[PDB]
Amino acid sequence: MLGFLSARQTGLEDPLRLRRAESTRRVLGLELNKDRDVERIHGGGINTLDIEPVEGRYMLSGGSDGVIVLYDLENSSRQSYYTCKAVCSIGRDHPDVHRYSVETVQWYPHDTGMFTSSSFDKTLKVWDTNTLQTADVFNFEETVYSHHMSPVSTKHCLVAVGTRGPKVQLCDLKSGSCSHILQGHRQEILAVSWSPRYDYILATASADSRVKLWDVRRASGCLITLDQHNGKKSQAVESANTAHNGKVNGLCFTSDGLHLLTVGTDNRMRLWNSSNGENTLVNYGKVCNNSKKGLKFTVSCGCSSEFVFVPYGSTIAVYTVYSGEQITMLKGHYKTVDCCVFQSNFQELYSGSRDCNILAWVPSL
Template sequence: MNELLFERSSGNTGPNVFARWQTTQLLKSFRPAPQFRFDGGERGTAVADGEASSGPSGSSSSSIWAHQAGVSALSLERFDGRILISGASDASIKLWDLEECGSPSQPHVFKPVASIVRSEKSHKYGITHLSFYPFDSAAFLSTSYDQTLKLWSTEGTQLSASFNLGNKVYTHAISPIASHLLVACGTQHPAVRLVDLRSGANVQSLAGHGGAVLAAAWSPRYEHVLATGSVDGTVKIWDVRRASALIGMLDHEDSLGLYHNGLLGADGKVRIRASAKAHTAPVNGLTWTDDGSYIVSAGHDRRIRVWDAATGRNTLASFGPSIRNSHLGSVTMFTSPVGLTHPGKELLFWPNDTETLVLDLHDGHVITKLRGTGPAVAGVRSTGGAERTVKNRTTSIVWRGAGGHGGSSGVVMGGSNMAGAIFSAHLDGQIRAWTPHIQGNDDEDEGDDLDGISEEKAQKRKALDDVFRSLMGNKITFT
């Protein structure tokens, strides 16, 4: 670090290179932040892993849940990174204001600013996916196993529109850049449903998958391009403007791409290999890098694959045997924003069952593992006496950059808010926070207890202070 500071001061290292090095170090240093808790107001008794049903946990703090039934989905608004919404297995939805936290170094218990409970007008079954309206945080979308897609007003949590899709809805996606306001819904039916928020109609069905659609993601570069993944192992690329919308399929055996493997016909059009499969098992995870250059897919074959979005070629990034993925539902993952790291050094954040892996996107090696503080198996005994035991799986993760979701200022923490964090949802009912470890944090130094500082450390500080004062106190004159 000192060498890098010297290189920057001497002009050998530019400010952008130094900033990327610093943010890369922060991205690799996330650790649990147990001082931040989410209390949804539900009461009961937590049962620890392996604990007999007659012996409830005596810790009062363990009886705080965001959703006692288990948190199944999360979403964070992308502008200020302030409003977090969470959905539960009991069909409830809660909104949290992350700006409640006065200082990121002080413990804080978040309380929901609004709640939506199960009712005839709201959802009846578990929430499967949540997302904010892309251009304004005043609205958000939710889908559920009750076969509906709903549009809500954030202010007052009022229902604005409801769409019955006729099948269980596993996921939905809305483009972050498009003006067409089409919501792609993956359901139990093999056809992808497109819902137009403007007209309130199901305007199109994209037929071609051989089973339920578990994953969907719009391109962040081309507003009409959509990628979807299915239980049949296929990942299809669509252009929703075309009558025959399918424009490509990803093939895990193709390391050259559509335009380089002899599939270009005499008419200049690309012929698609009908048997192409991205994975040998159901595909339940899809995301794009935020510059649209790469597509990342994940499947039940315990493989994560990275694809060149321009050609469709498999980059052959190997993520090793540690990947765990068996849940029949959409998996949320994300990549670090382009620009925070050096080109070609982007990171992938993957919810790996009971932990979150930070992986190098292009060579697949594990950078670090974010392991939760809760038990692997969690039980909850409600006030009514009912008890449930679940595997404490991570169901969703969201990214909060400094100054907003995915902000260009990265993960640097500062100011009075909790900027630069990852939030994860868990089936034990908790929402957990993860923050980067900042070396030499001024707040920590000011809050140090003098009794806890070793004598040697105090002497070194005094010596450095004396040197600094002696240098700054001498006036230098030139004759």
């Protein structure tokens, strides 16, 4: 670290070196901080967490009890020990509270004033953070497994919604049109994720073992269908071209958006070239998931080597994206881990679980 400081100070190394190397070291040193706590407000398991993209100060959390909690992640107290207090909450007494499990919650990108949350009550509600009131509600004919707003589109503000129906709903928050559907899947869409690179690329993963990349502008179906083998087992596309050998319940674009990570109920995680959907043949070993719903997992940002934090049973398995080497397993939960979310500002992790807890993992030293 002193060599790094001297090399930064004397100009031998770009300061980008010290940032990325030290962030990588902190991520490798990621450990359960009992010196930080998150206030327990959910009566049920936390299904989803979302730290705001701008300023990374506030976090949303949606539980199976239908409540939403809005936490402050900054140590506003002068002590080195603090609890991430719950700023707001859509509780059992809020007139607009979800009737069933909140399965996904997402801050509006580009501004903290709005956030959207979807439930098994077949609703995607848009909330005004300041008034903590719903500004819009999108009812769907079948329960929502996942929703996602594009983190990058300054032009369109579509929410891709995956429900049990075989179609992917696109809901325009700009004046309300929830009619557009992307058809081509055959079973419930368990995960949707916009590319962080292209405004109009949407990756959708479904229980029919297929992941499809769509160009929502295009009127001619999916761009690419992910194939495990890339052509070794080739068939006229009616049942082949499966991304996994089970249900694909999790999607995550890497930071630069040039690759896609999919996790399926075949207990595998695969890394795909997001441009031509080619499997990169990164191993990753066995990634235990048996989730019957969407599995929210994240990647690291702004480190020398990219990492993926995937829920592995009751633990969080940390892998290197481009080599597959399992860095570690963060073990602090008591039940299955449903979601983990990455604070890129300080290389911190927050993980929710069915044990109705949110555990913060902070780098040690």
